């Protein structure tokens, strides 16, 4: 019941303490059908070169560590042939499968929230100001919340309790989420369809969603348990189309 395997492209994920699989709203990723489509030309569908498991660098869960957030896409923009089609094409569409992997022993304790947020529009630190783009996303390097209210121009107000969007950080359970309770499971999987209000949308301009990992109950251990507990995030596109080819963008 706890074993599971996810085979996408030329990549596989094995797990032995999985709780379940959140499918975002009961909905699986699918291709754009003929009657909901708006672009005239034929789309590219690479299907095995792009819909595989790309692994982002891992973060160290410390005893006093507020949280982390990534923005998808713009995290996978330098990942293989997803981040290349994504350059050469104007319009892109894709769902994802997010597998978060954090393992500890039976003498450790903790609890992460793993939550995908659609359109996680964020709030600058100076109330009368504007974010950067760097302040929303570093690529594959995660941005970090803060245990107190942050200052400084153009940088998101990243106190954890508000989650940078101005809401309560405990109500985030309305979004597709899981927990990683180091006493029961050691991985969370969320299957995320293409949620957006236009059929296809550009991939550099719009951060389609945000993955937040927030430890509610912090780490702890005793005499000489292992001090280093890392968290690794793997994302895998699904049903990925692109449309509108031309010369490659540049930033």
């Amino acid at each position: 019941d706890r074993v599971r395997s996810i085979t996408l492209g030329n990549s596989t994920i094995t797990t032995q303490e999985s709780a379940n699989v959140v499918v975002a709203y009961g909905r699986w990723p699918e291709y754009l059908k003929d009657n909901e489509a708006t672009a005239e030309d034929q789309p590219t569908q690479p299907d095995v070169a792009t819909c595989r498991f790309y692994t982002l660098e891992s973060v160290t869960w410390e005893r006093d560590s507020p949280g982390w957030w990534w923005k998808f896409p713009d995290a996978l923009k330098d990942m293989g042939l997803f981040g290349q089609n994504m350059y050469y094409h104007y319009l892109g569409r894709a769902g994802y499968t997010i597998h978060v992997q954090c393992n500890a022993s039976k003498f450790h304790q903790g609890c992460l929230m793993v939550v995908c947020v659609p359109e996680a529009e964020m709030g600058c630190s100076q109330v009368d100001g504007t974010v950067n783009e760097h302040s929303l996303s570093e690529g594959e390097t995660a941005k970090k919340f803060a245990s107190t209210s942050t200052n400084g121009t153009n940088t998101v107000q990243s106190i954890v309790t508000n989650a940078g969007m101005g809401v309560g950080v405990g109500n985030l359970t309305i979004f597709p989420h899981q927990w990683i309770n180091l006493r029961t499971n050691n991985c969370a999987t969320i299957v995320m369809p293409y949620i957006n209000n236009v059929p296809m949308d550009n991939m550099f301009r719009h951060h389609n969603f945000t993955l937040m990992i927030i430890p509610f109950v912090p780490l702890d251990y005793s005499s000489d348990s292992s001090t280093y507990v890392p968290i690794t995030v793997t994302v895998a596109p699904m049903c990925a189309e692109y449309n509108g080819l031309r010369l490659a963008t540049s930033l």
């Binding site: 379940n20 699989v21 499918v23 709203y25 009961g26 597709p176 299957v191």
Partner: protein, 59 residues
């Protein structure tokens, strides 16, 4: 004359009203205050495998 006689909102423990539309555009109609539908399992139970409420959530 193109009417429709639907039912009013009465409590539980001469109840039909009449509607006619006058304008050429559906953006001119009334509001649909008498559709009550639900599907909470979309947000309440968004999981791949079912969980049967009398078996352990794991195991």
């Amino acid at each position: 004359m193109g009417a429709q006689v639907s039912t009013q909102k009465t409590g539980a423990h001469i109840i039909h009203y009449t509607n006619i539309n006058y304008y050429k555009d559906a953006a001119s109609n009334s509001a649909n205050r008498q559709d009550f539908s639900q599907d909470p399992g979309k947000f309440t139970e968004p999981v791949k495998d079912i969980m049967v409420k009398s078996l352990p959530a794991l195991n």
